[PDB]
Design a protein around this ligand. Structure first.
Ligand code: FES
Ligand code: FES
Ligand code: FES
Ligand code: FE2
Ligand code: FE2
Ligand code: FE2
Ligand code: FE2
Lengths: 424, 180, 180, 424, 180, 424
């Protein structure tokens, strides 16, 4: 693949996606090098690793990493592979360590992944530059509880990288001076489809919720009403000025939030003391109290639904499979029973077995399975939805905003950025 | 467990059989997509719980399963379950339209009478075989810890508690759209 | 089914056990490549039937299994079965030379007495594990609906009807050269 | 792979096959583009989709297709993938539809796969060229009940493409003015070996039946006789003049037909009213009443055994696996019990668990598994059987006919054509 | 086998149940990583044997399983087993730190009284489901031929002989670090 | 991959391994052609195929082979694939044949894999050069009971190829005029990791045994002692002068041998009649009676542990998986109960479920799984252990010997040779 051909893969002006971007093995490797190697990737929430010595293990692309709380409370992130013969340094999902020891040949490491000492050092390795021979370190930068990491020496800091996307993250991350904790437990599952289908959906695909994709999941949350459900039609969608993030949300119409989250949560979110505090902080009565679902992706694979409050990372497993690692965040200071309500509700809906995410699983697999065919890969997909419907100067909402919640303008930005990243 | 620290006391064979038969019937209901009747087996105070499970170092092993107030694969009361039943009676429930083909092998059934009259603590082992579409195959195994309550129904029991102890950390399928 | 719309009536434990034991014995016969003795279990009016199964939209679901006069994985009388036995007693039967390694887990056994004296309608659940050559592994699951007839034989029963309800649309193996 | 190297892969004059043609992943892709994309492929039988609204789903290579009966009783065939984000349009093996709706975002389609309308059309897609954005359509042409499809704009029509192969198809397809119906039910199974082994066998491999491959399957059909079975030795084999089809059959010797189909069917096929009607129509007493098995392939992957009457398509799944989708055809007007007899017999013999096809499954897998090795791929296979034994002017049988039923002349044609297709 | 050439004689249901219950308990012990208690079930003269199995042409089939004085997957006395238990009580036993998640489905249980008082020959069928780390899944099946001896213990039996007859030639996992 | 880039993959002077050598699919193919195709590979022991007509089946890379005892007691080795259409000629692990018959079309073969005759020969193949069309033959050369094979027409004979590696093999193979028999039974298992990790470990990795890898396996063999176990520190390591073999062993310290093999075997091995006979034959009291474990690899994939006495072949299955086929050798004349003791002990320790090899299985898989990541493949592994600590003129031990049993000098030779083989 030379640069020219990589450029042909997505056409923004025309609005067309070459489905080969979801299937080609070589592009997948390029992605791992040019996207995942240089982007800020979501590793989890701070409250997942509270005390010093605490770690969790995840992935940053397909490189496993250890994420460890330090004595000064920093967060260290190193490649989870001993440089000797590549054994896994940390071998558990989560726990607490004073040190790490490679179980193949016993090289040992401080909680920050520095190689401190090596068995039979004096006789066998006396010259061992233990700094050069420590596992690769990643830059760690958090944003209001979310832990991000980036391998790249010289990429813009998380704050620049997010840009005005921060504004939308705030809708969930900054509704109180208390911030957010994550309800303990991360749910993990394998979905054989390309990571971009997942990322793109959370970026801009309100369309699917508001049409046929989740008709039954909605019906599950309704009292004993049938197929005459009012779908919200007023809303907005945001496309980042740079970097490929996007978010969309409904305004004013509490119908979809009611079906998903129930009356207790929808109440907490839109009216009463906690909703007011949000409106105040967020600088707007609309932002704090009028936004009803909202979906969002921080490019490449960081996704969440403010209001529903599931957060997840899409872990790529080749072009043909993706793992979902998802947890749920609540305002740290929200009452007992609101937290519990957020727990029961998120798992009932946006989980592996949830009445919503059940169906996304089923669709996504099919999409990919088809792509196994030749003629199925030979014509572009249609990304032309709601073209030229964006002002970039809204009084309240930054970036490229549209008034049609049903648009692929955000999606178009995601792919346009992916394209920049791939061709550079 | 708690209850199962000590090998259960022997029980009358007709009790063993009464309970085993319950489970076989329940499996036939699930496996034959007779969801309406299956939900009828759920007691009004149903608590349907399947904790997330994690890979832990053996000293840390008390933290293997998600706890009481912690995220989980399922953690449903009767109202939440009703909604789920309402899903699997929709021609718009894609994950079960077309329907999965499931099989529930049930074995290792152990019974201990509980404090209350006509309630029982059960441990059983399962394999669930889920086949769907052309070539999709998923195989789960685990343990079901149940509390059963005797009943005037034709089935004879209602399910009060179910705790599904899956033998998986990461879920190795693209969803859990059926019932354990 | 037809017979299994209503949870079966309780049965004497020695009947449950008599039937379960039959199946365990039958499994040992199949699993231990004792084909000659296994065929002896087949009643003279044997009808050995395994319908093809299809992925259907849930309103269309009455058409899931192939019907009476329709193509099927197996649909054999005693004469057809005799020929099949004659195959698996050949050093030239390549699909079973070398032989498959099979395992038949049998559970969920439910019994209903039929109209005729000493006949029974059975529902059981199975997993069949078929391993062969170096690395070939196939795992099937399903239900066996049988009609058993009492017998003067050492086994005690003959198999009159068998309907194997496989949990697969497309068969996920390169053949079905063993017996369910 | 440049053209030169593709040419080296098969040598017809010498009679040699490079086993890499059964294994190389890249050649497999070329095949999907240069063979399956431009050939007429078997999708099933007409009586599988009788009333308007009826559909079945299969494959045309690895592209899934919907095959739907129309109001004017035509047969529409479209790629089974919504052009929006690629979801499967039709999600069942068979059924009846007034319309199709994509379950991801609810785009809807007439029974012929035209995109009729799209949710929130006016606001989001008002410019949507619904014709350009409909799933790819395939040309459909049937031959006496068999449904064929071809993507290619400009390939010869099925009738030209078949050429004189029609003559041999007629032996099964045209024995009565009533034509053929398919017994309901298609049996599907996965065989991990290259599709060409299956195709080639049905094309020209009488040899395997008449030697060691099916010794036990024959013995299964014999009365309580042992290893002293008379194998028919008189027969013919046909190699198409163009296009790579082939067929072979026994003449006069009812021994193999008796073992496979039993006396009831063998009778029906060779003597009595129905056999006579066939002889008359077929223009010859020999053709109608003297032909005893017969195997045949319509290149690439359409295969059947007139007399046994199993039909199948070999669905390619990469170079290393193939699905068999097989059904059974009977003369529409043959008596009740003959039809039933054809059912019981075909499934007892040429099915996944049939006493014949059992063993082909087992062999084919081994062939492929071995090919995993290096030295196993480094020398040609022997395709030199019965060279130079063909007249091309037989009084009765068209094309290149031989008198040795045991020949790889047909096979040689299959590969020679595959070679033409691949290098063009 | 030897013992199982002839369909076993009927047994009292409380015996069937006593033995089945033993196995269920034993499975719970293994599956719940209660290794210390599991080893306690091993009789002092324990002989724990799992022959290697080979793909043989059907005339050669008497040579399928490794014999008496021949290499094997396991062939342990009480001393060898003690050492193995000592391994799975180490935070340095990597193959079981973190621990595997196992499930033992137990079925097809057939009982024959042996010569000695209170000893029994058993045949049962199993599936073992072994899940570990993130995504590692191994599924074994086979038969366990055991000799059980009655006991003053709370369990009621000790395992004297175990012969695990695996349905695999080549072992399809990277190790066998658990117990059948 | 051009030669230049293949050279960069391993740097001996610097001591660095590019982990891509364990993962890259294309290099894997090159390996099959340039390493396995031209090296002497271990197929098993002579006593596995005793009488004429006896065969076993294994692999020589990924080509399956038949290994058959002949009438003159030679050992024939042919590719296990009929040249007709590639079916497996011999379809069992082991047995006794007068002849072989291909089960697809019945071509038949003498016990040495010559095609003797072909069904319908006169009519169909009368010109068939049965010698040209026989399965590929491999050169067979044994060394003191171990059966080796090589495809290559013109590679140095096993004896030259081994070079002074023979010296170390003798420690296990030549301790008596009686030689060695193999205890019947080969244990086979699949380990998803690259074959080089296994080969390299047996070549030079005493380090892993003497540190953290097998702490629990040692503890299993100790009386009811805890974590205060004395690890032997005196020993030597050998790097072959050419060809990439290596061996290391402890001297004098019976502690590790006691933990693994028990007192009965350790006794037999170091003191008493049989130990003396060994010392005499081996020419040295040290060699015969003072060596306590010892590990060794005959490049590429032949590995054993003299003293423990497990032998194995690492069968490559792509870059990401390897099969272990392992058996146990005893001195043919050692007493009954010593043989039995060697049996129980080897299986208790160095087997799939053995208290040692259990853990190697677990580690190796992780190493490979990690390598799935991008950044995990982008920096070298550290192969700099114990540099420049080798004399090449020891009075007793030939080749490049070191006094540090804990060294990667042998490993460095393995890779240096692999590099020679790959670039030539
Ligand atoms: S690979 Fe970790 S110390 Fe060797
Ligand atoms: S992919 Fe079908 S409507 Fe979107
Ligand atoms: S492939 Fe062996 S005879 Fe044909
Ligand atoms: Fe969704
Ligand atoms: Fe019972
Ligand atoms: Fe055949
Ligand atoms: Fe080791």
């Amino acid at each position: 693949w030379n640069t020219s051909e990589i450029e042909a893969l997505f056409d923004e002006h025309a609005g067309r996606i070459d489905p080969r971007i979801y299937t080609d093995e070589d592009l997948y490797q390029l992605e791992l090098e040019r996207v995942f190697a240089r982007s800020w990737l979501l590793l989890g929430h701070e409250t997942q690793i509270r005390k010093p010595g605490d770690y969790i293990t995840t992935y940053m692309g397909e490189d496993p990493v250890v994420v460890v709380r330090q004595k000064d409370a920093s967060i260290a992130v190193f490649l989870n592979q001993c440089r000797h013969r590549g054994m896994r340094i940390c071998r558990a999902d989560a726990g607490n360590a004073k040190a790490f020891t490679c179980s193949y040949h016993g090289w040992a490491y401080d909680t920050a992944g520095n190689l401190v000492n090596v068995p039979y050092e004096a006789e066998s390795f006396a010259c061992l530059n233990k700094k050069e021979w420590s596992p690769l370190k990643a830059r760690v930068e958090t944003y209001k509880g979310l832990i991000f990491a980036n391998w790249d020496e010289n990429a813009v800091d998380l704050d620049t990288y997010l840009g005005e996307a921060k504004f939308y993250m705030d809708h969930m991350l900054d509704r109180t001076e208390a911030g957010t904790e994550a309800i303990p437990g991360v749910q993990k599952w394998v979905i054989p489809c390309n990571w971009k289908f997942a990322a793109e959906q959370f970026c801009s695909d309100m369309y699917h919720a508001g049409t046929t994709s989740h008709l039954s999941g909605i019906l599950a949350g309704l009292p004993e009403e049938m197929a005459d459900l009012a779908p919200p039609t007023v809303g907005k969608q945001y496309r980042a000025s740079w970097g490929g993030h996007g978010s969309g949300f409904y305004v004013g119409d509490p119908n979809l939030m009611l079906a998903i989250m129930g009356p207790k949560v929808t109440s907490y979110w839109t009216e009463g003391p906690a909703s007011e505090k949000a409106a105040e902080r967020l600088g707007s009565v609309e932002r704090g109290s009028k936004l009803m679902v909202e979906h969002m992706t921080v490019f490449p694979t960081c996704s969440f639904l403010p209001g529903i409050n599931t957060v997840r990372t899409w872990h790529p497993r080749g072009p043909n499979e993706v793992e979902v690692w998802a947890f749920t965040v609540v305002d740290a200071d929200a009452p007992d029973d609101i937290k519990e309500e957020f727990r029961r509700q998120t798992l009932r809906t946006f989980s592996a077995g949830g009445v919503f995410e059940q169906d996304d699983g089923e669709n996504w697999v099919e999409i990919q399975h088809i792509l196994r065919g030749h003629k199925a890969r030979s014509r572009p997909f249609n990304a032309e939805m709601s073209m030229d419907q964006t002002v970039d100067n809204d009084p309240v909402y930054p970036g490229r905003i549209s008034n049609n919640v049903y648009s692929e303008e955000a999606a178009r930005g995601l792919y346009a950025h992916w394209l920049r990243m791939m061709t550079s | 467990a708690d209850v199962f620290l000590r090998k259960p006391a022997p029980v009358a064979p007709e009790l063993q059989h009464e309970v085993e038969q319950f489970y076989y019937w329940e499996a036939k209901l699930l496996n034959d997509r007779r969801f309406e009747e299956w939900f009828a087996l759920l007691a009004e105070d149903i608590h349907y719980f399947m904790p997330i499970r994690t890979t832990r170092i053996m000293r840390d092993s008390r933290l293997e399963y998600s706890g009481s107030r912690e995220y989980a694969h399922f953690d449903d009361d009767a109202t939440m379950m009703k909604g789920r039943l309402r899903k699997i009676t929709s021609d718009v429930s894609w994950s079960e339209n077309p329907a999965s083909r499931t099989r529930h092998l049930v074995s290792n059934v152990m019974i201990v009478g509980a404090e209350a009259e006509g309630e029982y603590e059960i441990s059983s082992a399962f394999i669930v075989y889920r086949n769907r579409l052309e070539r999709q195959l998923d195989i789960f195994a685990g343990e079901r810890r149940d509390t059963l309550r005797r009943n005037t129904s034709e089935a004879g029991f209602e399910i009060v508690n179910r705790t599904i102890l899956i033998d998986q950390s990461t879920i190795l399928a693209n969803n859990l759209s059926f019932f354990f």
